[PDB]
Amino acid sequence: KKPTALIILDGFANRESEHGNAVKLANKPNFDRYYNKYPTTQIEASGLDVGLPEGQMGNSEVGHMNIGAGRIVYQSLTRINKSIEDGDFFENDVLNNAIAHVNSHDSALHIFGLLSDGGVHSHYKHLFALLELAKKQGVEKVYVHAFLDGRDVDQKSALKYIEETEAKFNELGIGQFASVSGRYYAMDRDKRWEREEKAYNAIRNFDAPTYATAKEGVEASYNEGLTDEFVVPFIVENQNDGVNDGDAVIFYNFRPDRAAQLSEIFANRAFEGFKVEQVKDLFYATFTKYNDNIDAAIVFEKVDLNNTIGEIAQNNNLTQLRIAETEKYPHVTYFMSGGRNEEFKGERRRLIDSPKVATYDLKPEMSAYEVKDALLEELNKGDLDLIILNFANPDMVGHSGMLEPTIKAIEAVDECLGEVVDKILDMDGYAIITADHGNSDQVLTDDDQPMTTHTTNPVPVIVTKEGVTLRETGRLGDLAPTLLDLLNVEQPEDMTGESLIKH
Ligand SMILES: [Mn+2]
Ligand SMILES: [Mn+2]
Numbered sequence: 001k002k003p004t005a006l007i008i009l010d011g012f013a014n015r016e017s018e019h020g021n022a023v024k025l026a027n028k029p030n031f032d033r034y035y036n037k038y039p040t041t042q043i044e045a046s047g048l049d050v051g052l053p054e055g056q057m058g059n060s061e062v063g064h065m066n067i068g069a070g071r072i073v074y075q076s077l078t079r080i081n082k083s084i085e086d087g088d089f090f091e092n093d094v095l096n097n098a099i100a101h102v103n104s105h106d107s108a109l110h111i112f113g114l115l116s117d118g119g120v121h122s123h124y125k126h127l128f129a130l131l132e133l134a135k136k137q138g139v140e141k142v143y144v145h146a147f148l149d150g151r152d153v154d155q156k157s158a159l160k161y162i163e164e165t166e167a168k169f170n171e172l173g174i175g176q177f178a179s180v181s182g183r184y185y186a187m188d189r190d191k192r193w194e195r196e197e198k199a200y201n202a203i204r205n206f207d208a209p210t211y212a213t214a215k216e217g218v219e220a221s222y223n224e225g226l227t228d229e230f231v232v233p234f235i236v237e238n239q240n241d242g243v244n245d246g247d248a249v250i251f252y253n254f255r256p257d258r259a260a261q262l263s264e265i266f267a268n269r270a271f272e273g274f275k276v277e278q279v280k281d282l283f284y285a286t287f288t289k290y291n292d293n294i295d296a297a298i299v300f301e302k303v304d305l306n307n308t309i310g311e312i313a314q315n316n317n318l319t320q321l322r323i324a325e326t327e328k329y330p331h332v333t334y335f336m337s338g339g340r341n342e343e344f345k346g347e348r349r350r351l352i353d354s355p356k357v358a359t360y361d362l363k364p365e366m367s368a369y370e371v372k373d374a375l376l377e378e379l380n381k382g383d384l385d386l387i388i389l390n391f392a393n394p395d396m397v398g399h400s401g402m403l404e405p406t407i408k409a410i411e412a413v414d415e416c417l418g419e420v421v422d423k424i425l426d427m428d429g430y431a432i433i434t435a436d437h438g439n440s441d442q443v444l445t446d447d448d449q450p451m452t453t454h455t456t457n458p459v460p461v462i463v464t465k466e467g468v469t470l471r472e473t474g475r476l477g478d479l480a481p482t483l484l485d486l487l488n489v490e491q492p493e494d495m496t497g498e499s500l501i502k503h
Helices: 029-037 060-069 076-085 093-105 124-136 158-172 193-203 214-223 260-267 309-315 326-335 368-379 393-398 403-426 476-487
Strands: 004-009 040-043 109-114 142-148 176-182 234-236 248-251 283-286 320-325 347-352 386-391 430-434 459-463
Touching: 004 060, 004 326, 004 403, 004 476, 029 403, 029 430, 029 459, 040 476, 060 309, 060 326, 060 476, 076 124, 093 109, 093 124, 093 248, 093 283, 109 124, 124 142, 124 158, 142 158, 158 176, 158 214, 176 193, 176 214, 193 260, 214 234, 248 260, 260 283, 309 320, 309 347, 309 386, 309 476, 320 326, 320 368, 326 347, 326 386, 326 393, 347 368, 368 386, 368 403, 386 403, 393 403, 403 430, 430 476, 459 476
Parallel strands: 004 386, 004 430, 109 142, 109 248, 142 176, 248 283, 320 347, 320 386
Antiparallel strands: 040 459, 176 234, 430 459
16 A cells, blocks of 8 residues: 655745744755655745735644645635625624614614734624624614723734724714723633623623723723723723613624633523523624534534545545644644544544643654654554644744754654655655644744744645656645645545646
């Protein structure tokens, strides 16, 4: 059996500058020999090319979902952005039923959400689109409950989003701030119900301070040394008439973890974090499904991905291995399989334990040698058609923002890569060597401070097949087509990416 392997060097990309560039400063003679011998190109792993907004750096979850899917997998922010840009949003059934509930009960529409452009949990421009829809459908009373950010965006930036939003209310002639809460209170995720109950009480016009304007309460908070995230919830005088029977709520956050708790308070009948009388006849709508204990109408339902690489392998009676150390094990399993835990038929997996250290600069090789020794043991069985391997080190060590250890991490991975790839070539097989986004390519700012994040840089591709030319550009969704091409397996129509090998 001739194996084909995808080998993901996590957080390893192409960047022109050598300054703070561990990829370029490392001694990587195996990678370099493969790169000089075999066909090569580079592909995009950030922004629109992987289903993220323009200018947004790639990441492991979105990267491995795009790799495994063989298509661009649109993440929530972009999905919703595009729904707004092309009209479907204003047609959405769930939002229009929310509105029909209010219109038909002569009650109130409430909107909850993180009021920033952070884009991790929400985007405030989706609030504006909801205001427009409500206005088009003639709703009269819209109450906006602002949760302030300061965490995904500058720590004192709330006043500018509030200012713009107040102009939106005036421009559309609809909506008002009813309550204002730091995300500390409204978006807690550790079952600290005391914090939540403060946000609830302000939303509901029960117990809270009151100020005349959103600006005034935030400015008062700044004065006491409490920035955005930590603003004590408050009610806006004469602009809050409570959440009453018959009302509707639309929560525009798309990220589940920090939105679930507040939603359980309102719309989990079994909620017992503290005592409540829940609203009767409440239409509670969430932009996504936050958990299965919230009785909500879901605005953007999850889409299951059919025919990821692993499902195609299965349906061609191939065997596959997923292998990584702990830190990238969900990536090569769950995310690779399109957000599915269950193994495919003919799939087996190998988890290697990562070291238990606070930061991986303390052991730059991590468990890369044991991953490689596991993989060698597996290949010696001679029964694998497909391998998906991730070497975690460059991303996990690179996050430390320390150059010499990130270099050593890369050098450790290069030693393992030589052993893995030479064994595969020995077996008359093929490797695709690539990455899921950048990081170790830049671990220093231009002024030599630690830089600890991913990059937007494009990622290398090496395909270890002689006498073939790669396409000049492409994207992560092209990698699984390239695997199928190497395996001579037919590619189904719902994999819309394209093999990197030219024909
Ligand atoms: Mn990654
Ligand atoms: Mn990372």
